[PDB]
């Protein structure tokens, strides 16, 4: 259905910071190419 008629709305800062934090978290794990344990 249309969200304008149903009134289902979300803030912009919960949508912007979700796409900002998820790509920076996916960048850090993708930069791992070697494992060292002690």
């Amino acid at each position: 259905r249309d969200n304008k008629q149903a009134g289902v709305f979300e803030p912009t800062i919960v949508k912007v910071k979700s796409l900002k934090f998820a790509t920076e978290a996916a960048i850090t794990i993708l930069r791992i190419d070697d494992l060292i344990k002690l």
Partner: protein, 124 residues
Amino acid sequence: RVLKRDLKRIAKASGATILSTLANLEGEETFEAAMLGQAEEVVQERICDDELILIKNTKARTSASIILRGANDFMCDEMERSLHDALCVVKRVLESKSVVPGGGAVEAALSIYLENYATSMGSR
């Protein structure tokens, strides 16, 4: 026999200060024109099984009250948490200065625009 947490919203309504002790460290005074607020009208409204005290047109309160009159304690306790859950839905939306239609409407529109943007760049 007024509750303490109810009095913190009353003193915040009329802008008055809560006085803990009446003794001003050497004697006894009432602290005139300091712990008093302003209002318009206080009516003792006849409500069934609890005669309430309503306050109108205080200094800076902006709050109100909803009297959930019902039949028993089963339908009144479930309707109070329904009003509290419906309050936080409208509250968290109308704060942040602009909103976006969510619930799957954001990511479905981004799946088509970012694919057409991907065919415009190239370069691995």
